[PDB]
Design a protein around this ligand. Structure first.
Ligand SMILES: Nc1ncnc2c1ncn2[C@@H]1O[C@H](COP(=O)(O)OP(=O)(O)O)[C@@H](O)[C@H]1O
Ligand SMILES: Nc1ncnc2c1ncn2[C@@H]1O[C@H](COP(=O)(O)OP(=O)(O)O)[C@@H](O)[C@H]1O
Ligand SMILES: Nc1ncnc2c1ncn2[C@@H]1O[C@H](COP(=O)(O)OP(=O)(O)O)[C@@H](O)[C@H]1O
Ligand SMILES: Nc1ncnc2c1ncn2[C@@H]1O[C@H](COP(=O)(O)OP(=O)(O)O)[C@@H](O)[C@H]1O
Ligand SMILES: Nc1ncnc2c1ncn2[C@@H]1O[C@H](COP(=O)(O)OP(=O)(O)O)[C@@H](O)[C@H]1O
Ligand SMILES: [Mg+2]
Ligand SMILES: [Mg+2]
Ligand SMILES: [Mg+2]
Ligand SMILES: [Mg+2]
Ligand SMILES: [Mg+2]
Lengths: 370, 370, 370, 370, 370
């Protein structure tokens, strides 16, 4: 069989080909201790990975090796892969093909270096890399859709029509879960809660996951928060402090629809989606207003689908039906689709073999991968 | 029995001999995908034909293999025939004679190549090809008429008198449905609607079919459109956009009567018809002002017959009666007449047999076919 | 001196009396622009004449004011005369007698109107009009002949015997250069070359002039064209396209001998000539089988004389000699003869003077002119 | 005198009639600040125009009021005109006629609204609007040509023959400088350089202007870029970052010849030009393969002329000469020609006067302007 | 006139609007006696403020009511304001508008409570509060800059561009003068000097002010201190003890550039400044590397500017000029700028009036103040 690794910008997910769910999902982070090892009797490591780092954020600088889908630190990413199969899946990469995923329009050098590492370091027998949105559409089993994939680091919109690309109408924006988390720390300081540190960054991430929700109508929610306290429920920090969060619960997610709050000129997910559809030919807009496929954990916000419906129906022409496809598996939809793709026997001829790499080195990829 | 295929420049029509209506009518188009097959799991074809292409114009370059009655792309025309009987009618061409149709004064090489293909590729047992206008007159069951056949690609006028040709007074003009569609796109851009693409070309075709009508008096209609909005009704594009079309509804069809708007020097259908009649002998002009037979879908414009009446009565001498024969079956009148002709037992001796082709090859046709 | 103007149906030719060759020869055409004058800074005219029109056929409707020897458009013919002397010869018509020419059996009204215009508009001091064939026989200096004059618009046969008319045996047929050109466009479309327009009409005229030749034996030529490619040489259109012309080179001229290809019942030039001779008295047929005088540019076809010889010797009785007089000056033979006639001092008493016109108006001509 | 304003889709150009060069050339853009005015003591404006906006793109949403030659935002266009004469030229529009320019086949409503504004708002005494290509041909002083005008927003091909329009063979495509700039941002992200924002859009425009060149042979250039680094020179962003650009330098301009890279079906400039010429009559194709007139800043790419020569000579028939007229003044060729036209005394009768507007309102224009 | 009070986290500064220098500058501290009043005849107070407290630190718990820019003890802050105008300036707050200052991103509740107190307690007629960095930039009279304001309690970086905020790129860190003082006590204990108490805290503050300097190169200074004694000069405690301070003189200030010594993850002032600039748009980074404005007494360290230059030039791209604006008035630059702002007549419409407060209470401020 083959390995499937999404290389998630925020949470790496890996598992065997043909498996319906990923077996290893963990933060794609590394931890470099801040402090001296004065308890000499303790056995220690120079660095930690994933959950091991998450054990003890208070002593670590957490660093994400992927920023906005770009590998910024190959040294650490190597560890992430190494840990993923040698320690967590406990799999020999030398014995199984592995399929990776990358955001569209990503830097060509990043892809080359990725494959160079994977062949020369982990000595994979075969390799492939694919666009995440494609895979997430595989998971739906659809022929057509426009994939509003919004991972931790990147939100990218890909229209697809019965398996033909529409490369001229891809949209990509940097606005993603990480920017939302930074914004949340920025506003949540409004109440006094500091959260200066990268550890508190990792806590405010959890506050986002658990308490934030998408406002169906921002103004209405603001009004009712100005009048009603029922919105301003509460969360407990690891120290036991109890914090409360009112309008902030939905103000932050609202940024997805009004990025200008962050200073980003690019419009929200809804507007970008509409614009992308418009950039496609009139013929396909018929079907691409249907089959809007949400994907990624950034789409896991409660009420996101409803807001998308509202917005797009307002933007889209009259007499045009909108259908937001919002499966429950959104967090995994990419990995599942990669599993399906790798399982296809027809696809088995697509893998870049160690032979082809030896024939052509890291620049082979552009001739093979989609 | 024998097959009857009109080989329509815009919509191929085929069916069994003796059938009163064609069973397969479809656009004579092929589709070559513009884009990469990134959804590798989708089963796909290198090209599409007819309705299959029409499913998904947004991803295809639509190409008509017949331009102005000339086969410009034998590679695709072969597919059109192949699809017509092997896939749609689901008929063995090896077992049934097939009767084709061609515009008059057409290039001799096109006819030769046509028969060469049909004998050598599809191995038809017997073959014949006839002038479309003749067949359309058969469908009327008349002995005499002047056939103002106006297909998608060609408009050609043939006077016929009790089954004798009048080859000296045939007229042919390139002005046809396709030119009208191009003109419509040209003017309809006046309002902003772009329709640059071959897909939008295929939409504007439908706008023509559904909304355009022939002005009984162009100036009057222009005036009332300048004063009355009741003319400027509306159509819905596949994306759901709603467009409105005023004087353009009848300005475009008017080109049939004033081709100079397109820059073509040749006069309109009415003038050409009159001129052709005049080129016949005085004896037959008596009857050829009667029995004017409209044919082809280009003649399906509402009010066309009335305008023809008006114009010809104005051009024709006094005391001369004009009678525009305008059956409801105009779109099919050629194919129906071919069906009748093939059904005639007397005609069964006219077919060019596989024997005669083997005796004489592709140049046999000139000695046989009318 | 006097002006001599042949008023050629296809190429007007004019010059001074006593001159051995015409000084102005140009197409008898006018050009009415098809299109708007958007380049406002260009100085322009509402219409063009002759070579000025020929400069820019692509923007003009070329119209011949003379059809089959009948002035169909006096408005334009007036321009042709006006241009001829006021602009090209740069001669005052008010100061010089002018001699015109007309086909025999031509409409009496055309002759009346011609002289009415010439006296009332251009105020010529003196006027005469003569039959073209007569003049062409003058140019030969013969006393007897049968003149097979074949201009652009009309072919007319006049037997003449020592200066006595034989009005009972004149033959006239519409078959002429223009009909040949139309036929050539008709057949040459066989290969694909469209030539729909009046401009392409004027190009196909040149194709006729340069490549066509008369078949000594049509069947033999057809056979050898079916076997030999050496016939099918080639011509270059003004756009630079290169066309080839095989049997068409001689098929078209053959129409002169078998007009039935065009549907005209009247027999060919040879048959008509023979018939006319037969309609003369037995006495003169002795000499009229000799002194057959070719004339007009339609007779400029290579090998025409040989074919005439063959045909007439086959039709004519045995022991009868045939002699086709085929000078090199055929294109001009009418005008030259008119020059000679006008130069004759004896003829100076024949001119219709401005005095006689004032005495009797346009109907004087029938009492004077031959 | 009269004002001449090209109303450039990307750079408005204005100056006095009879001037050989425009005095005001500036981006046709407006700037709406993104951020609060916290430095209350600073005197500020609600919006900025042209160079004032360009001073400080980092705080502005740059918006072009003209998209593909269509005024999309009359509110801002009004400012552009207002600034042009009241602030930059410092001219009273109430006292000088002004001549505008518009792309051919443009929406009729846009032209009406344009003149309505100019008469009712700026109270011009006289007005005219003309097709840009015409003017650019004036600047050449030619009688004939085919104008491959390629502005920022629109590329449109107009054949012209001695001042007669050929409206039947105009071609227009949306592919222009702006699309090229978007494509450049799209590909240049290949290296990592983000350029998400409208400000970075305006920087990448400069990268295009300064570093891009047209490949004489795309494949050869690609090969040598794959082998040679000498192509991949470098540019400095305003922040001082230094970027390098290899094959991208010529890949982007190549889109002009292969728009399919952008997904546009319409062929390149060369193909469109050839097709347009072919759509003209055979007569004029002789001269329109000569006198191909380049125009617009999109044509300023180095080596564009050579590529055009190569392509057209390959497409055009043999024995046909091609002559790409490539003056150095291309950026201004429209405005200069408008200056010439307005200077013509003969043209002084063409202006639409405030009187005629009062007589007939905004719909007068269609009866007057070309 | 209006009062200007900076509400300095470490030294409150107050004076009249339009004054070039603050008239009252004093520690923002209160003193609560530790001990019984056994000398009953002495007249005494329950608490002391500012300099009165500083008279007799040995008997007082010094408490700063502002911690890291947050009012932690409203009871004492009220006294600070009360003393400031009723006792030191000897001004009626009921009669003069007062302008306060606050750090950016500060808790919204603190601002509300501030204005509530100032209106309800001191009954100010008018009120405004502004960001300190803005004011400090006013004092420079610049349109653009990035303000590295480092007060006693907070260091906060604000980029400003021609009076538009860049709220997305503000940085704030807790590292300030107070943390430096704590660190100094921590290290200076290395030599034996205890300084446990809040009084000795207030002495070590003076040691910092008088002896510490910023190392241009920490390693070099460490080396030379390891070799040279000339660094280790000396200070006299109030008791007359004489202490010496070597590498400690510059080790402590170095923390500003390497906060990790204190365990703070956030990078130094230089790194934060660079990062903030980077978070601004490329357009403005051109000018924000210039016009770096130092502010606050924490910036008064000798050689700080040089180190900033060095660091930023090393971090900033090549060919980018850096200009550290380091006026001599740094301690007062905020207050002076507030004076200027209040003096502006245009600003007089910005004050929140007692009327508006009565209309809207403490929550008015968010709608008014920047
Ligand atoms: N409950 C949640 N609600 C909203 N966003 C979430 C939630 N859980 C995770 N995310 C966001 O999205 C990421 C996980 O989703 P995923 O789509 O798999 O992207 P990635 O694989 O790049 O992390 C996060 O790390 C976080 O920013
Ligand atoms: N409702 C309609 N009104 C006018 N023209 C039509 C209509 N439907 C089809 N046509 C035109 O004529 C064609 C169909 O008619 P037909 O006479 O069978 O010719 P062909 O077989 O060459 O298409 C078209 O493809 C179109 O140009
Ligand atoms: N080389 C040629 N070969 C055959 N026919 C020609 C040639 N040149 C001209 N003609 C034909 O005859 C005309 C010129 O000859 P001409 O006898 O003077 O008659 P007209 O004066 O009526 O034109 C033409 O315009 C053309 O139809
Ligand atoms: N050096 C250059 N090379 C290529 N294209 C350019 C250059 N300078 C400007 N352009 C392009 O063309 C425009 C300027 O040329 P112009 O023909 O006057 O059209 P417009 O007036 O509509 O801007 C641009 O704004 C840009 O897209
Ligand atoms: N000479 C000095 N060198 C370095 N820091 C100083 C000096 N004097 C005062 N400071 C520091 O900064 C403060 C005074 O500066 P200021 O910028 O006005 O901030 P604040 O108003 O919050 O005190 C102090 O109380 C102290 O931490
Ligand atoms: Mg993922
Ligand atoms: Mg048909
Ligand atoms: Mg003649
Ligand atoms: Mg321009
Ligand atoms: Mg301060």
């Amino acid at each position: 069989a083959a390995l499937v690794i999404d290389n998630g910008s925020g949470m790496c997910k890996a598992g065997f080909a043909g498996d319906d769910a990923p077996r290893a999902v963990f933060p794609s982070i590394v931890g470099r201790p801040r402090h001296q090892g004065i308890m000499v009797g303790m056995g220690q490591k120079d660095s930690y990975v994933g959950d091991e780092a998450q054990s003890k954020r208070g002593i670590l600088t957490l660093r994400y090796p992927i920023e906005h889908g770009i590998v910024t630190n190959w040294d650490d990413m190597e560890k992430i892969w190494h840990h993923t199969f040698y320690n967590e899946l406990r799999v020999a990469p030398e014995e199984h093909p592995v399929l990776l995923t990358e955001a569209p329009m990503n830097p060509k050098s990043n892809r080359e270096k990725m494959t160079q590492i994977m062949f020369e370091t982990f000595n994979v027998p075969a390799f492939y890399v694919s666009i995440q949105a494609v895979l997430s559409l595989y998971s739906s089993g659809r022929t057509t859709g426009i994939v509003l994939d919004s991972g931790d680091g990147v939100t990218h919109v890909v229209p697809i029509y019965e398996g033909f690309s529409l490369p001229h109408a891809i949209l990509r924006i940097d606005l993603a879960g990480r920017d939302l988390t930074d914004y949340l720390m920025k506003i949540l300081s409004e109440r006094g809660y500091s959260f200066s540190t990268t550890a508190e960054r990792e806590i405010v991430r959890d506050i986002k996951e658990k308490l934030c929700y998408v406002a169906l109508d921002f103004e209405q929610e603001m009004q009712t928060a100005a009048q009603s306290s029922s919105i301003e429920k509460s969360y407990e920090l690891p120290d036991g402090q109890v914090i409360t969060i009112g309008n902030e619960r939905f103000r932050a997610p609202e940024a997805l629809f009004h990025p200008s709050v962050l200073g980003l000129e690019s419009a929200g997910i809804d507007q970008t989606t509409y614009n992308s559809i418009m950039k496609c030919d009139v013929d396909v807009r018929k079907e691409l207003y249907g089959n809007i496929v949400m994907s990624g954990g950034t789409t896991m916000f409660p009420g996101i689908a409803e807001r998308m419906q509202k917005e797009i129906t307002a933007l889209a022409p009259s007499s045009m039906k909108v259908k937001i496809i919002a499966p429950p598996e959104r967090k995994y939809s990419v990995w599942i689709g990669g599993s399906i793709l790798a399982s296809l026997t027809t696809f088995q001829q697509m893998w870049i073999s160690k032979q082809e790499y030896d024939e052509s080195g890291p620049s082979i990829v552009h001739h093979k991968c989609f």
